[model samples]
Target: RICFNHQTSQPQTTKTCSPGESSCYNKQWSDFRGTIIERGCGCPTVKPGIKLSCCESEVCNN
Candidate 1:
């Protein structure tokens, strides 16, 4: 599957997931600079009070 990939302060792009990979993830939180946004092709750890999202379709993290 295809997914959105990006990190804080970087350009957003699309990624083709590896074999056996089938999901995308997005996360958000506040930091000293401002709100930080993250996206990639897998679900990471979960934290409280932060926005987290996961999906199983193409470019779903965006």
Candidate 2:
């Protein structure tokens, strides 16, 4: 697991898996600022049976 902290910029999530594993499952995002941004899944090529999550900041309804 990895943890990222940034201000004014959105953080990116990346994952590394074994051979034959999908990278899509290794991507995700998190809104630490609680902005009204529509959050969505990152990489979708992740291999099955893997678990991951990521977060980033987008245009908020402030």
Candidate 3:
């Protein structure tokens, strides 16, 4: 389950990004910090029996 929310109490949560894509994420600066992902997320996309996750704030993303 991917989760990236700085709005929480910790920028260093369990993260549990548990995943990362290989598409050109170069422009996605917010998704990263240096080389290691500042945090990992996908808005937790899904299909079929999937249940997507949401953000803690109104913006819904970094």
Candidate 4:
């Protein structure tokens, strides 16, 4: 996800990874705000709202 200063903000939403890579994100809310690190490319960890897809060349429809 992207980071927005809804209460404090920037248009910071451009970088995205493919697979076996890590990325940064924003987890925002009222009175509670924080950041998130995402592991893309079918890693061991999976996020709640993010899409998880296989990155290998074996199969995409599997």
Which parts of model 4 are misplaced by more than 4 Å? 1-42, 58-62
Query: Model 4, residue 3: what's the lDDT?
Result: 18
The residue-by-residue lDDT of candidate 3 on 1-62, one tens digit each, is 43443432345333444344311111122323432222244343334443234444322343
Model 2, residue 33: distance off in Å is: 11
Clashing pairs in 2: 22-47, 24-45, 24-46, 25-46, 28-54, 29-54, 29-55, 30-54, 30-55
Best by lDDT, which number? 1
Question: Which runs in model 3 stand beyond 4 Å of their true positions?
Answer: 1-13, 16-40, 58-62
Poorest lDDT segment (10 consecutive residues) of candidate 1: 3-12
Mark the regions of model 1 whose C-alpha exceeds 4 Å error after superposition: 8-10
**Candidate 2 least-lDDT 10 residues:** 53-62
Report how far residue 55 has shifted in candidate 4, in Å: 3.7
lDDT of 1 by residue, 1-62 (tens): 88888776687798888978888999999989798888988888878978998999889887
Residues forming the 10-long window of minimal summed lDDT in candidate 4:
1-10
Q: Please, what are the lDDT tens digits per residue for candidate 4 over residues 1-62?
A: 22121222433333334544443333323323553333222234444664433333322212
lDDT of each model, Cα atoms only?
A: 0.86, 0.32, 0.34, 0.32
Q: List the residue pairs that clash in candidate 4.
A: 5-9
Candidate 3: 10-residue stretch with minimal lDDT: 22-31
Query: What is the clash count of model 4?
Result: 1
TM-scores of all predicted structures: 0.78, 0.21, 0.23, 0.21
lDDT of 3 at 28: 23
